[PDB]
Amino acid sequence: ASTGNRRSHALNSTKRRWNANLQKVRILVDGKPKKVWVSARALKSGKVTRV
């Protein structure tokens, strides 16, 4: 997750974060099936296949 700013209309700055769209799925890590937190963009990409 990256840090940045939330900006008001008067441009007042407040620190905020951008979180990943993590989804808890099972992806068979190192041969062994395992439920892990994985980003939806990573699931779209195709490097990680569920089940």
Partner RNA sequence: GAGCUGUAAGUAAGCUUUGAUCCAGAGAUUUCCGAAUGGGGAAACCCAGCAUGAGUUAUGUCAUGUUAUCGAUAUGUGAAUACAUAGCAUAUCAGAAGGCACACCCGGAGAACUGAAACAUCUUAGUACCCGGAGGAAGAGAAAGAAAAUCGAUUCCCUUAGUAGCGGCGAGCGAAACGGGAAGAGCCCAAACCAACGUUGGGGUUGAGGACAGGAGUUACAAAGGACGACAUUAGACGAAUCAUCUGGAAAGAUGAAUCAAAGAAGGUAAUAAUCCUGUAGUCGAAAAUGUUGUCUCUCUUAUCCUGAGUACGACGGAGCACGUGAAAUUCCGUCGGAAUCUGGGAGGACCAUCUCCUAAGGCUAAAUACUCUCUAGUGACCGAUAGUGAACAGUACCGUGAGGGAAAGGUGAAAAGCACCCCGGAAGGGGAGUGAAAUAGAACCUGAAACCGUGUGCUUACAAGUAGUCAGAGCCCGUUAAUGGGUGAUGGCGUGCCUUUUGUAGAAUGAACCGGCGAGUUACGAUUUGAUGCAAGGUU
Partner RNA sequence: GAGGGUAGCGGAGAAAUUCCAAUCGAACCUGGAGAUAGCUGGUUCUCUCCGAAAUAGCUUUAGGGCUAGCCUCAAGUGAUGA
Partner RNA sequence: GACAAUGGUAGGAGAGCGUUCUAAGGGCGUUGAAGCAUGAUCGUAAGGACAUGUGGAGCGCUUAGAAGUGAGAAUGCCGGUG
Partner RNA sequence: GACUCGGUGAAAUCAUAGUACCUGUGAAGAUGCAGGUUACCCGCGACAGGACGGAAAGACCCCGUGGAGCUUUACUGUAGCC
Rounded to a whole number of angstroms, the minimum distance from the CB of residue 46 to RNA is 6
Give me the least distance between CB of 36 and RNA, in Å please.
Answer: 15
Give a three-class secondary structure readout of the chain.
CEEEEEECCCCCEEEEEECCCEEEEECCECCECCEEEEEHHHHHHCCCCCC
Residue 39 interacts with RNA (CB under 7 A): yes or no: yes
Residue among 21, 29, 35, 50 that touches RNA (CB under 7 A) = 21
Q: Which of 12, 24, 37, 51 binds RNA (CB under 7 A)?
A: 12
